[PDB]
Amino acid sequence: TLSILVAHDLQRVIGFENQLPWHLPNDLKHVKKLSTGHTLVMGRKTFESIGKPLPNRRNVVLTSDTSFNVEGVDVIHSIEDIYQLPGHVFIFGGQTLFEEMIDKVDDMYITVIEGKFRGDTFFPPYTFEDWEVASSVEGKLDEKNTIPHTFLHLIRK
Ligand SMILES: NC(=O)c1ccc[n+]([C@@H]2O[C@H](COP(=O)([O-])OP(=O)(O)OC[C@H]3O[C@@H](n4cnc5c(N)ncnc54)[C@H](OP(=O)(O)O)[C@@H]3O)[C@@H](O)[C@H]2O)c1
Ligand SMILES: Cc1cc2nc(-c3cscn3)n(-c3ccc4c(N)nc(N)nc4c3)c2cc1C
Structure with a gap:
């Protein structure tokens, strides 16, 4: 399975100044x-934003930088390399990756941030004519989580 993972707001903002706006x-x-x-x-930009690989999963970074060799990170240099990765593969961002992969993935796990943030990067437009809503789950709000959000799982029709 090849999936997209993404958090985007009401206008498909995903980022501002190499960080999450929320x-x-x-x-x-x-x-x-x-x-x-x-x-x-x-x-590469998304990885430098996070700053380190995420534990207990394979971290693969796409970059043209041939000097890239980071501890706990696997490196690829082409989009084609993605299709040779075994198991469940998640496209993790950022804008460039989403744009390159939205037409290729089986499904998308979207967190819709039900707000309007300042962004400088965006998830590409998509229509529900192409995507079945496998599930839609309203996020629970509390002291630590104050922005309404919905978890969508969309599968390509
Ligand atoms: N809300 C979310 O779910 C979410 C998730 C992740 C990121 N983000 C946000 O997205 C923004 C970053 O997106 P971005 O588009 O600027 O950067 P990005 O997609 O994270 O990375 C851009 C870099 O990826 C490499 N790359 C992409 N395609 C390649 C290819 N086909 N071959 C070789 N290298 C390739 C290049 O690295 P090199 O220049 O080194 O060659 C390119 O400069 C940030 O604001 C971040 O906070 C949001
Ligand atoms: C601990 C942690 C830190 C994170 N920092 C970031 C970050 C920094 S700049 C852009 N994102 N994330 C990220 C990275 C990618 C995604 C994605 N594809 N989708 C969703 N929904 N959330 C993310 C959160 C992070 C995800 C986790 C689990």
């Missing part, structure tokens, strides 16, 4: 749960 612990727990024991593929 603080939402529950989204990070959601991502952690879904990808534990599986594979994450991310762009």
